XYZ file of C-alpha atoms in Angstrom:
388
model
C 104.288 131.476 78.344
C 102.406 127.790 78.050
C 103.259 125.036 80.574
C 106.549 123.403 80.484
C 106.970 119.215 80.495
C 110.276 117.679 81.680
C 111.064 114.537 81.406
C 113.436 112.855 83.125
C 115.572 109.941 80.781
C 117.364 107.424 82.935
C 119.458 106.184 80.561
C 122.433 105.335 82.729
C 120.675 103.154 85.121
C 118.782 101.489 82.358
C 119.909 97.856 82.429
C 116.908 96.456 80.536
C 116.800 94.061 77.585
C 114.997 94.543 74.262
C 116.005 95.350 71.005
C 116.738 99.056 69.970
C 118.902 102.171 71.297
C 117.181 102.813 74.341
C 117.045 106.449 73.796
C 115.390 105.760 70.148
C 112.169 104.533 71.315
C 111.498 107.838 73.501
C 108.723 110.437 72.156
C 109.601 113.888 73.112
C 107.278 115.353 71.314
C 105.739 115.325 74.490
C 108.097 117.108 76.497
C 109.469 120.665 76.727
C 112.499 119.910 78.000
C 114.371 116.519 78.392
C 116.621 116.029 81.528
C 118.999 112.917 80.610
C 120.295 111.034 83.691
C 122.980 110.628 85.166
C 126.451 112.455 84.935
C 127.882 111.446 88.431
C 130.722 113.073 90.237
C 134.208 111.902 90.212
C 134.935 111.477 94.799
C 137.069 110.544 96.919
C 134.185 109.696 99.439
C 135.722 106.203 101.497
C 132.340 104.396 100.597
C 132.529 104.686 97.195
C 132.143 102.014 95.312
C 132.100 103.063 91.696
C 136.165 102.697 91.444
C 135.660 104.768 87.689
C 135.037 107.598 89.916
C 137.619 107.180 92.164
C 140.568 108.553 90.011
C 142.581 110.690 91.913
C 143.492 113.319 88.605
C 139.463 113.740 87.868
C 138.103 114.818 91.412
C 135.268 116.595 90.981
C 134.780 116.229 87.585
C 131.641 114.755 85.984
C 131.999 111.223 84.904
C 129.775 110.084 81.924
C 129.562 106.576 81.766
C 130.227 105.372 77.630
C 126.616 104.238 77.692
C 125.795 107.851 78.664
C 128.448 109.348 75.943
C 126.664 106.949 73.313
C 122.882 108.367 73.678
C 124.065 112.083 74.383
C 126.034 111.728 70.936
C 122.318 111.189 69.175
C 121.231 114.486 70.809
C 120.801 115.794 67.176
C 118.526 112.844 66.169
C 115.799 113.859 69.163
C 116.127 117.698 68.342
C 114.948 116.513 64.741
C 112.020 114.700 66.274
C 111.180 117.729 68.386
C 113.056 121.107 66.946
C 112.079 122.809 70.259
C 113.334 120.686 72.722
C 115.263 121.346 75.281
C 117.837 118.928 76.227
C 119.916 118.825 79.878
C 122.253 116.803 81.183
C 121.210 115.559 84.766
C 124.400 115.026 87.268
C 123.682 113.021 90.368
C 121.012 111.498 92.067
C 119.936 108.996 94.981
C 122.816 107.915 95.952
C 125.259 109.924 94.112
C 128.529 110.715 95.901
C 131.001 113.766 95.847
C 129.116 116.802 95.467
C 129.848 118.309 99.135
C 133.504 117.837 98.145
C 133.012 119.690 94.662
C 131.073 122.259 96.424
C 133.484 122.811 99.100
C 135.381 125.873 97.764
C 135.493 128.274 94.975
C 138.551 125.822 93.810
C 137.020 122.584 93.960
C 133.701 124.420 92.385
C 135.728 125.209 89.270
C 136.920 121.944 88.505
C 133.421 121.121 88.404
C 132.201 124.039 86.537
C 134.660 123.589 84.010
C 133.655 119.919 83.430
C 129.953 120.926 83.611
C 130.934 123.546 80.494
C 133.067 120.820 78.453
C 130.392 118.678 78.248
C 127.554 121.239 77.408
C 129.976 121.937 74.125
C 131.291 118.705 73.415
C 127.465 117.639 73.174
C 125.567 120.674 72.269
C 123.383 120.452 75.293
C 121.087 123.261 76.112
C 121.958 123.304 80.255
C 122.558 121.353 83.057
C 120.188 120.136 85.981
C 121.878 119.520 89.272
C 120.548 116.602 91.254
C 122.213 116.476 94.771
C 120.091 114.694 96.927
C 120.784 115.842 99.793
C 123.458 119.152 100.858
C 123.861 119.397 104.884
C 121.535 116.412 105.006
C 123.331 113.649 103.320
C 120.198 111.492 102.728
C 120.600 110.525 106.547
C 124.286 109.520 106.100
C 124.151 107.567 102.864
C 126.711 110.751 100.900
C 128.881 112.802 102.776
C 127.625 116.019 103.632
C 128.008 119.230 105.950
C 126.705 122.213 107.435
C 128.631 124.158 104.524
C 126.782 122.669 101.844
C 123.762 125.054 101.932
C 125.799 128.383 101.339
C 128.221 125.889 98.741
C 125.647 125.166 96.947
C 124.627 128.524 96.102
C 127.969 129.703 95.272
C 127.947 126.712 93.011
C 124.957 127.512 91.512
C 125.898 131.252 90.911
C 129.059 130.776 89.287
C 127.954 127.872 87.205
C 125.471 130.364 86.060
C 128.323 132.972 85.453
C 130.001 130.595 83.379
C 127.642 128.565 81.120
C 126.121 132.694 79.977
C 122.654 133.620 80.553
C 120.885 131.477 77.742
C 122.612 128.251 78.784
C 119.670 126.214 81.278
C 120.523 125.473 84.762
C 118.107 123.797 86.876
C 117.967 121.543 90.156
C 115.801 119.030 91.546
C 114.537 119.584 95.238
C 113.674 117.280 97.966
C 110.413 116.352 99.712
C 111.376 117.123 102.552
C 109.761 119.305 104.798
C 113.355 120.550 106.354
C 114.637 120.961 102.361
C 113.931 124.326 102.087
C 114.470 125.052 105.553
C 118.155 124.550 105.982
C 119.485 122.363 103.217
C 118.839 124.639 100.117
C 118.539 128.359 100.500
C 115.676 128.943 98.624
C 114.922 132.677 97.551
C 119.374 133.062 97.085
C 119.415 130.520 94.381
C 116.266 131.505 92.450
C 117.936 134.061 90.187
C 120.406 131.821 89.085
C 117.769 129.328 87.817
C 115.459 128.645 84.882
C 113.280 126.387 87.280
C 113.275 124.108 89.740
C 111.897 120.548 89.989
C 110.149 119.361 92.660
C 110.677 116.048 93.840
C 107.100 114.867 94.668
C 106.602 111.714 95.547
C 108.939 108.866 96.920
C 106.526 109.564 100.087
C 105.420 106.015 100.952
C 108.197 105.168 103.708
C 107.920 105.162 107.313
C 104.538 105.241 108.486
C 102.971 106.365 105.264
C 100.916 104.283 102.968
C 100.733 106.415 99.565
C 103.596 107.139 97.467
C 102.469 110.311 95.870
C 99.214 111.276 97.250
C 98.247 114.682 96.079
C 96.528 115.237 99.144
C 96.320 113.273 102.452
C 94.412 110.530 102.774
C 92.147 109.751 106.070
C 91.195 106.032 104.610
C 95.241 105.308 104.749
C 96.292 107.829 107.523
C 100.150 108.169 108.155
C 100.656 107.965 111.985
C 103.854 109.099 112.987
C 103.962 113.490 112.335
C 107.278 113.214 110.550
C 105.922 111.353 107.882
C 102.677 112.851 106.720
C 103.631 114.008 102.754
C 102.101 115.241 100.121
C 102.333 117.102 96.754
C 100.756 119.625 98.156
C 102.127 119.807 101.334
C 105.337 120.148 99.486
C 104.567 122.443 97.353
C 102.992 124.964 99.852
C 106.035 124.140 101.797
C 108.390 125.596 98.910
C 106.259 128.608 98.454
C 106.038 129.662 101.730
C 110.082 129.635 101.649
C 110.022 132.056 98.904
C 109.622 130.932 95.525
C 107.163 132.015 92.886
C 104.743 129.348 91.784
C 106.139 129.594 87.916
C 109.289 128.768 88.475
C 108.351 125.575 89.961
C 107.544 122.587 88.405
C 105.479 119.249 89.806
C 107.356 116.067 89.971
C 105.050 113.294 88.850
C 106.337 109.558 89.188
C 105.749 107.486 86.427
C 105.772 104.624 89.472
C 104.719 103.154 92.534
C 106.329 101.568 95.520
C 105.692 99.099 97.726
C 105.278 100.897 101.314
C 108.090 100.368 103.412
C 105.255 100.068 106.554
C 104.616 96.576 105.002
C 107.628 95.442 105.583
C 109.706 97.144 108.327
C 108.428 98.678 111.123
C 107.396 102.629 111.440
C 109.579 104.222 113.706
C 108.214 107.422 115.219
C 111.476 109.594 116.820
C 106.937 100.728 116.906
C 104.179 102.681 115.616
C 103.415 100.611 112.583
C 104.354 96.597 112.343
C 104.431 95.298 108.515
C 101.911 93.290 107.251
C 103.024 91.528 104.358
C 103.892 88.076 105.110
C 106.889 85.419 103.556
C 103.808 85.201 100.979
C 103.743 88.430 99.948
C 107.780 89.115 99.967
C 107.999 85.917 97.540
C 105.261 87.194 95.394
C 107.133 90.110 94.802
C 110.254 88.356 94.110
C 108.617 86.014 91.664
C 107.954 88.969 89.832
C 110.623 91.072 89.442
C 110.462 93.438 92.338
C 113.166 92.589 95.695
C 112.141 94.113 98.323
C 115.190 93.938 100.678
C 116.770 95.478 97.879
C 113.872 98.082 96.867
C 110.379 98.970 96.767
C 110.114 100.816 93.433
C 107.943 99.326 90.643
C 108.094 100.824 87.156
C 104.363 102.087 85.376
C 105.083 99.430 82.657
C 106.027 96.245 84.470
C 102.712 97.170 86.685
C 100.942 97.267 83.681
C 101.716 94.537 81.938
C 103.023 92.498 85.370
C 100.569 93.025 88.159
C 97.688 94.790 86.876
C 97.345 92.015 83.669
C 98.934 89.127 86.500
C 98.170 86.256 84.037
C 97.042 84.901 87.877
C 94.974 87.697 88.293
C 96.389 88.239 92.035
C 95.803 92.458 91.930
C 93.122 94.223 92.454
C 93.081 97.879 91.047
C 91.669 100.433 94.008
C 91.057 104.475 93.589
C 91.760 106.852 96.963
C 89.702 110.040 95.795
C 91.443 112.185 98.971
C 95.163 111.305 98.072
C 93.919 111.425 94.210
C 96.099 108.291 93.048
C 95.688 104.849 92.443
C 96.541 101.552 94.435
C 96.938 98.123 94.204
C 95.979 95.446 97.090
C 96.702 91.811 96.965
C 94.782 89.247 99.460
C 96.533 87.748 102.725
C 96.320 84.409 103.759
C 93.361 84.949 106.329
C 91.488 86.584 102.824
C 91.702 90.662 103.488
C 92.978 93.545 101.607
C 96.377 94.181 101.923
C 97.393 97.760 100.404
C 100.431 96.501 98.223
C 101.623 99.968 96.615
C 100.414 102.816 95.265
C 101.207 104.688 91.826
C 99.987 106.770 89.040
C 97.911 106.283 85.966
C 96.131 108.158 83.230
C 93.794 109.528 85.753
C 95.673 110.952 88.460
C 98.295 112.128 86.206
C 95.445 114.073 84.642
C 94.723 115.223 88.122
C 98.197 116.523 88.658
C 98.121 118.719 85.793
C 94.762 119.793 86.504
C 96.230 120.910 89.965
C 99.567 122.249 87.635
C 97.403 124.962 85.738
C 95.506 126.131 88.669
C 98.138 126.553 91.443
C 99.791 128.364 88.486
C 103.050 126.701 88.925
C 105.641 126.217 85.911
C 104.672 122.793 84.390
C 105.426 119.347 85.301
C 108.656 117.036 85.772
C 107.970 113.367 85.620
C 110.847 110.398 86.558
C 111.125 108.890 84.188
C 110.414 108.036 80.325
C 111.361 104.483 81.005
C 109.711 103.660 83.355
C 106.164 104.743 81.056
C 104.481 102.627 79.240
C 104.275 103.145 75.526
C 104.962 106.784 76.452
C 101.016 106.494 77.708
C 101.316 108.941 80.776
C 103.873 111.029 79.157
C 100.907 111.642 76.548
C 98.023 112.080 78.777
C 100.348 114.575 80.576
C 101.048 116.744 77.632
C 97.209 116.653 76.206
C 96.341 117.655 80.119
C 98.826 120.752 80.206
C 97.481 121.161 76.584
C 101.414 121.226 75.370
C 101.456 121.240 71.526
């Protein structure tokens, strides 16, 4: 059994310009298995404000968006490309809404199992991959949740499993988290139900923490406050300690960076850290694309070809050799080094699969195909795991 790849395909939150089917410029002959995002979930949580999902006769259904109906429809054009690819449909998400309702009962569970299995045939698609981010947690209030939704979302997972058949792929993406595997998803009753699992590895630079996916901590850029100190490895040793083997796990790798959240809000310790960017530095970022009241995500290719080839040169490119990842620093007014966000490139991605093959884990995920550049990391991920 060689290394798997999955690659995550946000195709409905892509919103960018540029000639072409968005889908159609994708290589997967880099990738094992393609996860194409997102199905959401039809809800009737009060803060919803996609109205599409708020019809009463679909609850707890998965929506597709017609974008998303479009580019699964030319499913058989990528299995040409790649005749052993594996194709699933991702539901959910940040943000996504209405899977503690759909989880709630046996009932409720069916409705979405039977929607999960309609689209699998209508589309051909080899399995689904469950994104619920987060059950009993809630992402700190921003979908409903409940106690229940640990023990739901096993039954869930089970009798999804019973339906779609045994060669049918289901799969689910897990949360950094330290308390994830603790008391949100139960761990070792799920793992028979599941092809894999994808780790959610990075999204780590918020609070009091500097990198974004440092494989290891860093001492240069400590994180101060003890609920915030991340990394891959952390998270990973966290996941195995809860019970599962190392092969059914695979490493999420961000094709990304993000802006730390400790330069611009202050780290909370339950101030411990004050932000240092400046009006300067919150304009900069706005003159380029990148709002940071709204969010502090940065795709691989708009750092490319935006801040690390800045026709006004204003990045500097910087290595951290303990978190194993690259970051960027742009100059304050009074002329120092402000750390401006960290991310991934050919290097450290390298690194990660290095640390893939000997932790013996399953392969790698990586969010997301567009946000690469020229499929660049995508490839230097599959020569790394020596994928052919």
């Amino acid at each position: 059994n060689s290394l798997m790849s999955v690659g995550y395909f946000n195709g409905g939150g892509d919103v960018t310009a540029g000639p072409g089917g968005d889908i159609d410029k994708l290589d997967v002959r880099q990738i094992t298995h393609l996860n194409y995002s997102f199905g959401l979930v039809y809800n009737d949580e009060k803060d919803e404000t996609n109205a599409a999902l708020k019809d009463p006769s679909k609850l707890h259904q998965i929506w597709l968006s017609p974008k998303v109906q479009a580019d699964l429809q030319k499913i058989p054009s990528l299995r040409q490309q790649n005749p052993n690819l594996k194709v699933l449909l991702s539901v959910g998400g940040w943000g996504a809404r209405g899977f503690s309702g759909a989880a709630a009962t046996k009932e409720t569970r069916a409705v979405f199992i039977q929607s999960a299995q309609a689209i699998i045939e209508k589309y051909g698609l080899d399995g689904i991959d469950l994104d619920w981010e987060y059950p009993v947690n809630g992402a700190w209030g921003l979908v409903a949740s409940q106690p229940a939704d640990r023990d739901n979302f096993t039954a869930l997972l089970k009798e999804l499993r019973a339906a779609v058949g045994n060669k049918k792929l289901v799969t689910i993406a897990v949360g950094a988290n330290a308390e994830s595997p603790k008391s949100w998803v139960d761990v070792k009753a799920i793992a028979p139900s599941l092809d894999y699992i994808n780790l959610m590895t990075y999204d780590l630079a918020y609070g009091t923490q500097y990198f974004n996916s440092n494989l290891y901590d860093s001492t240069r850029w400590p994180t101060v406050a003890e609920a915030d100190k991340y990394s891959a490895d952390f998270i990973v040793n966290n996941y195995l300690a809860a019970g599962l083997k190392p092969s059914q796990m695979n490493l999420g790798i961000g094709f990304y960076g993000r802006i730390p959240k400790r330069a611009v809000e202050p780290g909370i310790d339950w101030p411990a850290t004050r932000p240092y960017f400046a009006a300067q530095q919150i304009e900069l970022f706005e003159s380029l694309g990148v709002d940071l009241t709204k969010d502090t995500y940065v795709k691989y290719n708009d750092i490319v070809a935006k801040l690390i080839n800045d026709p006004q040169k204003r990045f500097t490119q910087h290595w951290d050799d303990e978190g194993k990842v690259p970051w960027l620093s742009v100059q304050s007014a009074d002329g120092q080094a402000l750390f401006a966000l960290s991310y991934e490139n050919p290097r450290s991605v390298a690194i990660k699969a290095d640390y893939i093959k000997s932790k013996g884990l399953g392969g790698a995920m990586f969010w997301e195909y567009g946000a690469d550049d020229q499929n660049q990391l995508a490839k230097q991920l599959a020569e790394s795991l020596g994928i052919k």
